[PDB]
A paper describes a structure:
All CHAD domains fold into two 4-helix bundles with up-down-up-down topology. The basic amino acids contributing to these surface patches are highly conserved among different CHAD proteins.
We next compared the refined structures of the plant CHAD domain to the bacterial CtCHAD and ygiF structures. Notably, helices α4/α5 and α10/α11 are protruding the bundle cores in the RcCHAD and CtCHAD structures, forming a small pore in the center of the domain, which we find to be absent in our ygiF structure. This rationalizes the presence of “long” (∼300 amino acids, e.g., RcCHAD and CtCHAD) and “short” (∼200 amino acids, e.g., ygiF and SsCHAD) CHAD domains. Analytical size-exclusion chromatography experiments indicated that the different CHAD proteins adopt different oligomeric states in solution, with ygiF and SsCHAD behaving as monomers, whereas unliganded CtCHAD form dimers in solution (see the Discussion section). In line with this, size-exclusion chromatography coupled to right-angle light scattering (SEC-RALS) revealed the presence of CtCHAD dimers and tetramers in the absence of polyP. Addition of a long-chain polyP shifted CtCHAD into tetrameric and higher oligomeric states. The sensograms of CtCHAD and ygiF binding to polyP could only be explained using a heterogeneous analyte model. We speculate that different oligomeric states observed with the CHAD domains used in this study may account for this behavior. However, heparin, which is absent in bacteria and plants, was bound by CtCHAD with binding constants comparable to those determined for polyP.
Numbering used by the authors:
A (entry chain A), B (entry chain A), C (entry chain A), D (entry chain A): 207 to 522
Write the structure that this text describes.
């Protein structure tokens, strides 16, 4: 319930006012999810907490200059540290949720060796849940969140010589940053020759995310159909890049677990099961890679250019 | 924004009161989505409209006896007719959204023959959108929705001899129907021998949906972690059955389009492209079928039984 | 050059005479391949040596009763022992030949862990080659082969009360055993319901091999087109069963290697690579299993019945 | 029985003498297969006939200069025309043999539409068999084969100024052409960047075939183990290129049939079935393409260089 909600923004208000409203929104989502994290109700609470952090940090970087550099660095560092504090707990949840999926991919002879693997994930989950709850109930977290909400409540415009973007009308900044983000997707996707490297796809996934975040933040400035059509136009490409990277992340996680499997007889069976998963995910990922070129060429169309022009029409 | 929202229910109120609150909720979602359907903002509006209808009808059947038989039949028939009125428009949206996905599956030589296919879908979409908007702005729709909201606002309990379930406490009905729905999933899944037929999987998908709908309707009666854990336990199985049936539905749609392709030279190329999609979806669906047995056996576990017992503890 | 060569048989000679000509043929192929085995020229020499053994043993069992029971048991036991003596050497050759195939299936991160695996196979190959060459140059092998060629050169018919089939005309025995072998394929394939178990497919593969061996042994008794058409009719089914079992055998080999991987850190990486291969072969094998029912139903046709009738016409 | 047979060559005889022995061999295989083609016993007879033609033409081009230019052109043109005369008949046989394979790939709903497709192939087969038998029994074929065997029986060395290679010792020509063919595989495979184009793979398949043909022609000049090891080293790469091109050829055949399917209602169903096959073969071919880079890099190794050096040692 964090990526599905939109703000009502005034296109004529300063970008400073509207980014502060964004951060009031995302910090409210953070705090609203603490109780569910603490009570370990469901994995979705930590996920929305993380989504709010990630969108906050990404917009703060895209709109660098709306706030003073010191305050910007401070918000980015505290939010980065907070997100990193959730990584181990988030990993435990995600791979536990994949247990039956992963088990079904393997031969029957290799399925039992995953049981100790998942029991160890459950033990990790309890450890990292306790650790992150002490963090959440701690003064250092309380202090950062209190300072952050106080700062974003400060409506006075910053020094324009150190925060040059702050006083700019929201519509102007939206037009300029969305055009910039679109150009970055198109240029980078066109640069993607035949090699279709891991690095290129990883970057382009982030390029598309930045574009999406901007569209969702500024949605209320545009006719709703126009925003919705641009988001739809991006979806197949984003799904291809997202699955490619997600499979990469899963393979990186499983590879790191191989490095710390016990070097003994029970480890051998677990290693074979983990190798089976790595290999199957690898094969899946190469099929996804095979489709990237067509899907991007279909995105890089005249209709796509026209839809962004129709979106941004009448802005400067 | 219809499948993600939960009601606050009183476990001690009559089931009649709480099912009326369900229907006030689902009808409100219906009406809230009319404007977006009419303005053709995005496909999600019709989807949530349909989800609200489908969950309303399914709960009304699961809880047959909360309302008088004539009123029950009337609500089911009007909601069925309303849903069926959305089918053609919904199909146009869904297969248009699949355009780049479908195009990427085919050899380059067959991709161009899909362009007239999708232009014809777009023409269908405009036709069915105009037709469904005249329906939405019509007196017959207005009249049904007005009568339905008036009926669900009538708080007097019905004749217990013709609506025997109405006066029952909500907690009792929840316990009995969730246990019944769970038993139906387990029995039917165990009956699924090696043949793993289309009919068996289609039925079991509906069995799982009924169970899920009941859990989501009655969620607020239980500790949140307990509800969330039961829903998570079901997810991999539901995803397997859901993909199996969804691929079936897509194949049935593409098969019906083959029957009406023009019997001429341009039709030949389109038919080859449609055959390529049918065949590829078929191959995907058989791999999904291959995983059903393992995924169900993993669902049909002692932990699953224990979680439902913990969910329903203290109820009768 | 053992499975591709046919004998010229006289349909009116006794089956005893013609099975002795078969065994003179297969033993000649055995001896002709010794030099290439000894000089380790290529893997094909041991393969043809094994093919000749396997076809000899299988026909001896199918035509039980052409020879006295003691001589039959003696030939079967000596040929079985000889074949088993080639298994380790044959395995080394086969999996060494699969090295690049296997390496290409794995993620880059798992490919290096196969290098010690294949170096150990090469060491095994040299060991088992030396062992089997001492065997080949030994008196015990020389003695068995000398006794076997002397026995098959003995043209006197055996005691008909202990070898009741020996004096039967070749055409009669061909007709009866080919019809019996065909019925066994059809019955067993029809018994294969939806479970399509490993045991059923393993058996049916052998049923088809026995039928093929009989057709190839008795080929010269029939019009060449008729034999060739029956063999072609069987091919797709035999290829499906053959790949199914071959993948099973490869998985069994890789599973046995997992059991003896060192329980230490270098073993962990090798185990992951072996698990990746096992899993990928497993997935391939389930797709092959998925096609069995259609392929068998296509073999179990009226045309197939008619072709065998045309093959055997005029015989009793 | 044409690609499996080797000549005994004298390394010190002129290349002219030994290429004439090659052509006596390949023409003998051609004539030996006429009867089986005429009686339509099995598809293998036309296949070996074609293999003999293809290897004859390829060696004649690789060793251009062993014969006078006019005689070389004459042999190449007559052999090319003869091979082309077999193409339609060969296609009928090959796709008829694929009937059950192709049928098993398709959804049940599309399988019946292939029956008229294969009945039409059978009708084509009978047509092209009758046509090619009139050709085989004709004076024009008889005359060419008589002239060809007379020419290859002419042992006098040709004019060295117009056939400069003829008098060269066989060992020298073998060393030079095998080294040249190997370099051409390695250079072209290394030039294959990430694009891995259809053209590049098609060419490299032919590069590998030329190398293989030379090794098999000159096999008896080298220690048998050395030849066998070089052929084994090439096998996985040749299998990858061979499957890639074979799938391409099958797709080209099915694409050409789409162009001539009747533009009417029965054609629509057949087109969908053909499109399903095209698409499935396409997907298979892209997976094969995905493995090319690894398989080639494994072939392009130090061991491969060393094995060719050991093969050619002591030659100039």
């Amino acid at each position: 319930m964090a990526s599905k909600l939109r703000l009502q923004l005034d296109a004529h208000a300063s970008i400073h006012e509207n980014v502060r409203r964004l951060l009031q929104f995302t910090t409210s989502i953070m705090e609203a999810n603490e109780e569910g994290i603490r009570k370990d109700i469901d994995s979705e609470f930590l996920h929305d907490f993380r989504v709010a952090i990630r969108r906050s940090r990404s917009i703060l970087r895209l709109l660098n200059g709306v706030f003073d550099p010191e305050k910007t660095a401070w918000m980015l560092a505290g939010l980065r540290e907070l997100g990193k504090r959730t990584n181990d707990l988030r990993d435990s949840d995600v791979y536990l949720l994949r247990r039956e999926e992963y088990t079904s991919l393997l031969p029957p002879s290799l399925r039992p060796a995953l049981d100790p693997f998942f029991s160890d994930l459950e033990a990790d989950k309890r450890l990292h849940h306790r650790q992150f709850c002490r963090y959440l109930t701690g003064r250092e977290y309380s202090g950062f969140m209190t300072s952050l909400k106080e700062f974003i409540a400060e409506g006075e415009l910053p020094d324009p010589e150190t925060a040059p973007l702050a006083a700019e009308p929201t519509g102007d900044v939206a037009a300029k940053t969305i055009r910039k983000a679109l150009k970055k997707v198109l240029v980078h996707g066109r640069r993607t020759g035949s090699e279709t490297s891991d690095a290129e796809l990883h970057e382009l996934r982030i390029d598309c995310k930045k574009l999406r975040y901007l569209l969702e933040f500024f949605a209320s400035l545009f006719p709703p159909k126009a925003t919705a059509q641009v988001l739809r136009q991006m979806k197949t490409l984003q799904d291809n890049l997202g699955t490619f990277v997600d499979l990469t992340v899963q393979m990186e996680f499983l590879q790191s677990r191989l490095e710390t499997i016990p070097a003994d007889r029970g480890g051998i069976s677990e290693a074979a099961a983990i190798g089976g998963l790595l290999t199957t995910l690898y094969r899946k990922r190469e099929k996804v890679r095979e489709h990237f070129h067509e899907i991007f060429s279909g995105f890089d169309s005249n209709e796509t250019g026209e839809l962004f022009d129709e979106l941004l029409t009448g802005l400067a």
